[PDB]
């Protein structure tokens, strides 16, 4: 509905070979009012 | 090592595109008609 | 007196806008079978009026 909603959560984990077999509920972060037809996306990585 | 994300349609200046960068102590969310390069990365 | 021309409106588009969505692109409409890739004329119309 023309809104970009981002939810997030940070959890301390030990076994890193895969995602943990636990249960953590993401909490709302932002509800930005952005009107676009998002179809593709890409991740940014730091290049020192 | 992971800073942010970009969300768009053609990822060029033809159409508007979102972009999120995790500033060291801030956030730089901007939705503009960015002309994204073929290899986006945030250099320091 | 001149009927200000700075106020424009999209007369041609290839789809129906979703609610609260803004379109700002200025690409030429490919109306007919003509490629319309660059310039205008015949079946290539400038989207805004
Ligand atoms: C929503 O964004 C998508 C992504 O571009 C658009 O999908 C295109 O729709 C046209 C309709 O004529 C197709 O010819 C294209 O092939 C589609 N692009 C694809 C599949 O990548 C869609 O038109 C947009 N809709 C609105 C209302 O903005
Ligand atoms: C790779 O090199 C240049 C260096 O100025 C960089 O800015 C640009 O984004 C890259 N070029 C591409 C992806 O075509």
mmCIF file of N, CA, C and O in Angstrom, chain A residues 4 6 30 32-48, chain B residues 1-11 16 18 20 29 40-44:
data_model
loop_
_atom_site.group_PDB
_atom_site.id
_atom_site.type_symbol
_atom_site.label_atom_id
_atom_site.label_comp_id
_atom_site.label_asym_id
_atom_site.label_seq_id
_atom_site.Cartn_x
_atom_site.Cartn_y
_atom_site.Cartn_z
ATOM 1 N N UNK A 4 6.825 1.062 2.843
ATOM 2 C CA UNK A 4 7.934 0.130 3.005
ATOM 3 C C UNK A 4 8.130 -0.110 4.497
ATOM 4 O O UNK A 4 8.543 0.795 5.231
ATOM 5 N N UNK A 6 9.909 -2.216 7.562
ATOM 6 C CA UNK A 6 11.091 -2.979 7.940
ATOM 7 C C UNK A 6 10.938 -3.399 9.393
ATOM 8 O O UNK A 6 10.757 -2.546 10.274
ATOM 9 N N UNK A 30 10.647 0.299 11.135
ATOM 10 C CA UNK A 30 10.262 1.484 10.376
ATOM 11 C C UNK A 30 9.075 1.169 9.476
ATOM 12 O O UNK A 30 8.843 0.023 9.084
ATOM 13 N N UNK A 32 8.251 3.378 6.540
ATOM 14 C CA UNK A 32 8.496 4.542 5.698
ATOM 15 C C UNK A 32 7.420 4.681 4.622
ATOM 16 O O UNK A 32 6.958 3.678 4.065
ATOM 17 N N UNK A 33 6.983 5.907 4.320
ATOM 18 C CA UNK A 33 6.005 6.175 3.241
ATOM 19 C C UNK A 33 6.655 6.383 1.872
ATOM 20 O O UNK A 33 6.837 7.497 1.378
ATOM 21 N N UNK A 34 7.018 5.278 1.228
ATOM 22 C CA UNK A 34 7.743 5.304 -0.037
ATOM 23 C C UNK A 34 6.862 4.684 -1.110
ATOM 24 O O UNK A 34 6.391 3.551 -0.955
ATOM 25 N N UNK A 35 6.644 5.420 -2.199
ATOM 26 C CA UNK A 35 5.872 4.892 -3.305
ATOM 27 C C UNK A 35 6.714 4.523 -4.509
ATOM 28 O O UNK A 35 7.123 5.395 -5.283
ATOM 29 N N UNK A 36 6.965 3.224 -4.681
ATOM 30 C CA UNK A 36 7.712 2.693 -5.816
ATOM 31 C C UNK A 36 7.280 1.249 -6.021
ATOM 32 O O UNK A 36 6.678 0.631 -5.141
ATOM 33 N N UNK A 37 7.586 0.708 -7.198
ATOM 34 C CA UNK A 37 7.314 -0.700 -7.490
ATOM 35 C C UNK A 37 8.624 -1.462 -7.329
ATOM 36 O O UNK A 37 9.377 -1.655 -8.282
ATOM 37 N N UNK A 38 8.890 -1.897 -6.099
ATOM 38 C CA UNK A 38 10.111 -2.636 -5.806
ATOM 39 C C UNK A 38 9.997 -4.033 -6.399
ATOM 40 O O UNK A 38 9.080 -4.793 -6.068
ATOM 41 N N UNK A 39 10.930 -4.373 -7.280
ATOM 42 C CA UNK A 39 10.955 -5.665 -7.947
ATOM 43 C C UNK A 39 12.267 -6.410 -7.762
ATOM 44 O O UNK A 39 12.253 -7.638 -7.652
ATOM 45 N N UNK A 40 13.392 -5.705 -7.690
ATOM 46 C CA UNK A 40 14.690 -6.317 -7.467
ATOM 47 C C UNK A 40 15.392 -5.604 -6.320
ATOM 48 O O UNK A 40 15.041 -4.480 -5.952
ATOM 49 N N UNK A 41 16.391 -6.275 -5.752
ATOM 50 C CA UNK A 41 17.124 -5.722 -4.625
ATOM 51 C C UNK A 41 18.528 -6.309 -4.594
ATOM 52 O O UNK A 41 18.824 -7.310 -5.253
ATOM 53 N N UNK A 42 19.401 -5.651 -3.833
ATOM 54 C CA UNK A 42 20.812 -6.005 -3.783
ATOM 55 C C UNK A 42 21.386 -5.548 -2.451
ATOM 56 O O UNK A 42 20.948 -4.543 -1.885
ATOM 57 N N UNK A 43 22.370 -6.293 -1.955
ATOM 58 C CA UNK A 43 22.978 -6.038 -0.657
ATOM 59 C C UNK A 43 24.275 -5.252 -0.817
ATOM 60 O O UNK A 43 25.073 -5.524 -1.719
ATOM 61 N N UNK A 44 24.477 -4.274 0.064
ATOM 62 C CA UNK A 44 25.712 -3.503 0.108
ATOM 63 C C UNK A 44 26.721 -4.164 1.032
ATOM 64 O O UNK A 44 26.367 -4.679 2.097
ATOM 65 N N UNK A 45 27.984 -4.142 0.619
ATOM 66 C CA UNK A 45 29.075 -4.678 1.417
ATOM 67 C C UNK A 45 30.193 -3.650 1.503
ATOM 68 O O UNK A 45 30.486 -2.956 0.524
ATOM 69 N N UNK A 46 30.812 -3.558 2.676
ATOM 70 C CA UNK A 46 31.887 -2.599 2.886
ATOM 71 C C UNK A 46 33.157 -3.067 2.188
ATOM 72 O O UNK A 46 33.565 -4.224 2.326
ATOM 73 N N UNK A 47 33.780 -2.164 1.436
ATOM 74 C CA UNK A 47 35.001 -2.448 0.685
ATOM 75 C C UNK A 47 36.090 -1.510 1.198
ATOM 76 O O UNK A 47 36.240 -0.387 0.709
ATOM 77 N N UNK A 48 36.850 -1.973 2.185
ATOM 78 C CA UNK A 48 37.921 -1.172 2.765
ATOM 79 C C UNK A 48 39.157 -1.172 1.873
ATOM 80 O O UNK A 48 39.153 -1.752 0.786
ATOM 81 N N UNK B 1 30.660 -5.812 7.795
ATOM 82 C CA UNK B 1 30.857 -6.087 6.372
ATOM 83 C C UNK B 1 29.581 -5.851 5.575
ATOM 84 O O UNK B 1 29.637 -5.530 4.383
ATOM 85 N N UNK B 2 28.419 -6.007 6.202
ATOM 86 C CA UNK B 2 27.138 -5.750 5.552
ATOM 87 C C UNK B 2 26.631 -4.398 6.034
ATOM 88 O O UNK B 2 26.449 -4.188 7.239
ATOM 89 N N UNK B 3 26.416 -3.475 5.096
ATOM 90 C CA UNK B 3 25.988 -2.120 5.427
ATOM 91 C C UNK B 3 24.491 -1.916 5.219
ATOM 92 O O UNK B 3 23.769 -1.595 6.166
ATOM 93 N N UNK B 4 24.006 -2.113 4.005
ATOM 94 C CA UNK B 4 22.618 -1.843 3.716
ATOM 95 C C UNK B 4 22.127 -2.587 2.499
ATOM 96 O O UNK B 4 22.661 -3.633 2.129
ATOM 97 N N UNK B 5 21.083 -2.037 1.882
ATOM 98 C CA UNK B 5 20.454 -2.655 0.724
ATOM 99 C C UNK B 5 19.939 -1.562 -0.199
ATOM 100 O O UNK B 5 19.736 -0.421 0.217
ATOM 101 N N UNK B 6 19.727 -1.923 -1.462
ATOM 102 C CA UNK B 6 19.038 -1.069 -2.424
ATOM 103 C C UNK B 6 17.842 -1.837 -2.967
ATOM 104 O O UNK B 6 17.920 -3.054 -3.175
ATOM 105 N N UNK B 7 16.726 -1.139 -3.142
ATOM 106 C CA UNK B 7 15.495 -1.723 -3.655
ATOM 107 C C UNK B 7 15.009 -0.885 -4.828
ATOM 108 O O UNK B 7 14.807 0.323 -4.685
ATOM 109 N N UNK B 8 14.811 -1.520 -5.976
ATOM 110 C CA UNK B 8 14.410 -0.778 -7.147
ATOM 111 C C UNK B 8 13.752 -1.663 -8.181
ATOM 112 O O UNK B 8 13.407 -2.815 -7.914
ATOM 113 N N UNK B 9 13.584 -1.099 -9.376
ATOM 114 C CA UNK B 9 12.966 -1.793 -10.497
ATOM 115 C C UNK B 9 13.979 -2.125 -11.584
ATOM 116 O O UNK B 9 14.144 -3.292 -11.950
ATOM 117 N N UNK B 10 14.670 -1.115 -12.112
ATOM 118 C CA UNK B 10 15.741 -1.314 -13.074
ATOM 119 C C UNK B 10 17.108 -0.949 -12.520
ATOM 120 O O UNK B 10 18.114 -1.182 -13.201
ATOM 121 N N UNK B 11 17.168 -0.384 -11.313
ATOM 122 C CA UNK B 11 18.427 -0.052 -10.646
ATOM 123 C C UNK B 11 19.264 0.915 -11.481
ATOM 124 O O UNK B 11 20.494 0.830 -11.519
ATOM 125 N N UNK B 16 12.798 5.557 -10.132
ATOM 126 C CA UNK B 16 13.223 5.812 -8.763
ATOM 127 C C UNK B 16 13.607 4.514 -8.059
ATOM 128 O O UNK B 16 13.038 3.450 -8.312
ATOM 129 N N UNK B 18 15.103 2.969 -4.070
ATOM 130 C CA UNK B 18 15.462 3.108 -2.668
ATOM 131 C C UNK B 18 16.910 2.684 -2.438
ATOM 132 O O UNK B 18 17.496 1.924 -3.213
ATOM 133 N N UNK B 20 19.543 2.123 1.223
ATOM 134 C CA UNK B 20 19.774 2.197 2.660
ATOM 135 C C UNK B 20 21.254 1.961 2.912
ATOM 136 O O UNK B 20 21.823 0.979 2.422
ATOM 137 N N UNK B 29 18.891 6.350 4.637
ATOM 138 C CA UNK B 29 17.786 5.953 3.762
ATOM 139 C C UNK B 29 17.431 7.086 2.806
ATOM 140 O O UNK B 29 17.086 8.193 3.237
ATOM 141 N N UNK B 40 27.657 -2.466 -7.008
ATOM 142 C CA UNK B 40 27.509 -1.539 -5.879
ATOM 143 C C UNK B 40 28.289 -2.015 -4.662
ATOM 144 O O UNK B 40 28.223 -3.186 -4.285
ATOM 145 N N UNK B 41 29.026 -1.093 -4.048
ATOM 146 C CA UNK B 41 29.668 -1.351 -2.766
ATOM 147 C C UNK B 41 29.994 -0.020 -2.107
ATOM 148 O O UNK B 41 30.218 0.987 -2.785
ATOM 149 N N UNK B 42 30.013 -0.026 -0.777
ATOM 150 C CA UNK B 42 30.315 1.162 0.013
ATOM 151 C C UNK B 42 31.782 1.112 0.423
ATOM 152 O O UNK B 42 32.170 0.302 1.271
ATOM 153 N N UNK B 43 32.593 1.979 -0.177
ATOM 154 C CA UNK B 43 34.002 2.044 0.150
ATOM 155 C C UNK B 43 34.286 3.006 1.291
ATOM 156 O O UNK B 43 33.592 4.001 1.478
ATOM 157 N N UNK B 44 35.323 2.690 2.059
ATOM 158 C CA UNK B 44 35.721 3.524 3.185
ATOM 159 C C UNK B 44 37.102 4.118 2.938
ATOM 160 O O UNK B 44 37.618 4.072 1.821
#
